[PDB]
Design a binder for this molecule. Structure first.
Ligand SMILES: [K+]
Ligand SMILES: [K+]
Ligand SMILES: [Mg+2]
Ligand SMILES: [Mg+2]
Ligand SMILES: [Mg+2]
Lengths: 84, 129, 188, 83, 149, 80
């Protein structure tokens, strides 16, 4: 976009989302917390979207997520809801 | 590393004004930068500027009138007495009819004409015209 | 006990008629209303002031002890809505009492906590005034004429509770710190 | 520029770019001046009435003349009730 | 850029503008301090404690709920380590490199990296001596560095 | 019925003529006129901006007192 075609103080939300997290007008992370539930257990656990550790449900002792390079990969059975 | 935030701000404004941009971004912000911008705005060399809070040093967006020929920092900040202002203006300003040298005196940050009026010396911060 | 226990002015000063009226209102709120009876037994206000915001409208600002700020916050909405009906359309604002210390003189070895600085206290007051809204952004615009106008962004979640209080917030903040502030809700 | 008495002293007052505010010099042969005609309620051109825009060679050589002129015309048409 | 390389990476955390805890979080500050102290007693560094809290207990930032940093809480309870964690890890890396070099005299790259790591150790130790986080007599010696850890 | 306005019919004619079909590449100074890129890769031109620019060009042309001072030329065979 040409510089005079945009406002530096009122950038469109799409551009702000597309920008690097630190290069936005105000820094904001791309991570979030989620409520993950096992397939069979009613217990509900909070997990970081980019967890570096293998989160295990206390009740059934089952691994909910696996650390990766970026976002943690959840187990096939489990499902998540964005918490925020 | 970053040594003079004022230099970065003034250089960004100078480059943007040369390019013809209507707005420029200054990062990080500083109260010395804000005082310099207020001195510039007092004389019509810039438009409205807005400070953005990010729980950090901050950011400023400056409107550019197109009247700014060149704004610059002077480093190191030399001591300027009330009697050296004439020589400094001769060295730095294009003419005796317009242009300002910004000083930091014990009475505050001000242009050289006000420093002459109040008979206060200090240290040279920069210039603009 | 009497309603005087609900007002604790500094240096044991004698409150004016408005402080007494607000203390009485709090006393009847504690007594008649059973739901808030438990909460208001150990809550008292340092002082209460009246500030005009617009024609035919006014606002009342109540200062409360700093140590009871959390207790006041956890019951803020019910208390404000109950007190508003008694003042005939006057908004009620709760601001925790804080002390501002002047900067130490040049060359002095005295140290002042940063919380006691003027800027920190002003920021805390601004945070408290917009309760229950949460500030999500701050912009300061420097006008060509030399005036400053601050724009404060509030969370849209508390829109229904804060939209009608924007002018009162602006007037109260201007009275408390002499700063021009406008309030806007981010669009999304 | 004026004398102490108040007499005009400059040979002439050069034009300025409508977009960049730069001074348009005598040898700037890349600079252009454009007139945008005004229309009445029936979409007919009113002779002698138009909005004048001047562009310096610097902006036109940059390729930014088109967008700048579009923005300037939009603002001026909004102000002048030309729609 | 990097201190001891030509890397110019900018990857880092982006702290949210909101400094208050999320509404869904219900734990109390004394509870968080108790868990932090328990983890420290179990032998976890402040970085590890913060990672565990964020990944499991939903505590994005301990300062948001407690109002203070993890190391401050540990010090307030007399649980901070004698030497700071980062200096400890640097010394551990130096010890590992020296142990490897003991059996590999021809590994000149390891010698280069040991020089760099020990320069980092000395600069950090000087800073910690300036701030009184180490006793003035403290000195890093390669011969008996393994004892310190 | 519902007779179309002048702009409506003009844009319909432009669509019939495929005036809105760009190339696979976009100039950074022509981006403000492009609406969006289709899955194939051809950029779709915003016909409303095209009509507004046509009106603006007509406004500029009409103000020339002598039409003989205007020169219009096409290098390609199609536009001759
Ligand atoms: K380096
Ligand atoms: K990294
Ligand atoms: Mg400095
Ligand atoms: Mg170096
Ligand atoms: Mg870098």
């Amino acid at each position: 976009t040409l510089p005079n075609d945009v406002d530096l103080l009122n950038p469109p939300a799409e551009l702000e989302k597309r920008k690097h997290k630190l290069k936005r007008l105000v820094q904001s992370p791309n991570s979030f917390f989620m409520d993950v539930k096992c397939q069979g257990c009613f217990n509900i656990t909070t997990v970081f979207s980019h967890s570096q550790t293998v989160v295990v449900c206390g009740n059934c002792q089952t691994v909910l997520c696996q650390p990766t390079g970026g976002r943690a990969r959840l187990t096939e059975g489990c499902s998540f809801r964005r918490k925020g | 590393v970053r040594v003079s935030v004022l230099n970065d701000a003034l250089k960004s404004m100078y480059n943007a004004e040369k390019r013809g941009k209507r707005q420029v971004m200054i990062r990080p912000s500083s109260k010395v930068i804000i005082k310099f911008l207020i001195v510039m705005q007092k004389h019509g060399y810039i438009g409205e500027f807005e400070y953005v809070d990010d729980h950090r040093s901050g950011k400023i967006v400056v409107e550019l009138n197109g009247r700014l020929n060149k704004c610059g920092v002077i480093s190191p900040r030399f001591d300027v007495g009330v009697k050296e202002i004439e020589g400094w203006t001769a060295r730095l300003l294009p003419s005796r009819q317009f242009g300002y040298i910004v000083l930091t005196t014990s009475a505050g940050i001000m242009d050289h004409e006000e420093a002459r009026r109040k008979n206060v010396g200090g240290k040279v911060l920069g210039f603009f015209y | 006990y009497t309603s005087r226990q609900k007002i604790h002015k500094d240096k044991d000063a004698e409150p004016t008629e408005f402080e007494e009226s607000v203390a009485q209102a709090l006393f009847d709120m504690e007594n008649t209303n059973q739901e808030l009876k438990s909460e208001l037994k150990d809550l008292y206000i340092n002082s209460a002031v009246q500030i005009d915001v617009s024609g035919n409208k006014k606002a009342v600002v109540i200062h409360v002890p700093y140590r009871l700020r959390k207790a006041f916050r956890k019951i803020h909405v019910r208390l404000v809505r109950e007190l508003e009906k008694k003042f005939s359309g006057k908004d009620v604002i709760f601001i925790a009492t804080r002390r501002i210390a002047r900067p130490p003189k040049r060359g002095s070895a005295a140290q002042r906590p940063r919380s006691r600085t003027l800027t920190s206290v002003h920021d805390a007051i601004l945070e408290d005034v917009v309760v229950p809204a949460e500030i999500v952004g701050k912009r300061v615009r420097y006008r060509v004429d030399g005036s400053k106008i601050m724009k404060v962004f509030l969370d849209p979640k508390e829109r229904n509770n804060t939209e009608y209080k924007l002018e009162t917030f602006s007037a109260v903040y201007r009275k408390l710190s002499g700063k021009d502030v406008v309030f806007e809700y981010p669009i999304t | 520029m004026q004398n102490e008495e108040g007499q005009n002293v400059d040979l002439y007052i050069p034009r300025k770019c409508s977009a960049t505010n730069r001074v348009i010099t005598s040898k700037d042969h890349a600079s252009v001046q454009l007139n945008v005609g005004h229309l009445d309620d029936k979409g007919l051109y009113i002779p002698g009435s138009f909005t004048t825009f001047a562009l310096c060679g610097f902006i036109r050589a940059q390729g930014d003349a088109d967008s700048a002129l579009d923005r300037l015309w939009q603002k001026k048409k909004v102000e002048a009730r030309q729609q | 850029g990097r201190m001891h390389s030509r890397g110019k990476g900018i990857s880092a955390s982006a702290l949210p503008y909101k400094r208050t805890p999320p509404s869904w979080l219900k734990i109390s500050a004394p509870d968080v301090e108790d868990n932090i102290c328990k983890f420290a007693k179990k032998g976890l560094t402040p970085s590890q404690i913060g990672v565990i809290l964020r990944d499991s207990h939903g505590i994005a930032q301990v300062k948001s709920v407690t109002g203070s940093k993890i190391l401050r809480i540990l010090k307030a309870h007399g649980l901070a380590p004698e030497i700071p964690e980062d200096l400890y890890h640097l010394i551990k890396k130096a010890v590992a490199i020296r142990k490897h070099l003991e059996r590999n005299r021809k590994d000149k790259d390891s010698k280069f990296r040991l020089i760099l790591v020990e320069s980092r150790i000395h600069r950090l130790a000087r800073y910690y001596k300036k701030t009184k986080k180490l006793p003035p007599v403290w000195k890093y010696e390669s011969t008996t560095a393994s004892t310190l850890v | 019925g519902r007779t179309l306005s002048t702009k409506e019919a003009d844009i319909q004619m432009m669509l019939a003529a495929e005036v809105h079909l760009g190339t696979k590449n976009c100039d950074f100074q022509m981006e403000r006129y492009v609406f969006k890129r289709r899955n194939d890769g051809i950029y779709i031109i915003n016909l409303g901006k095209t009509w507004e620019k046509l009106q603006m060009a007509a406004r500029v042309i009409v103000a020339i007192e002598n039409p003989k001072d205007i020169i219009v030329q096409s290098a390609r065979p199609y536009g001759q």
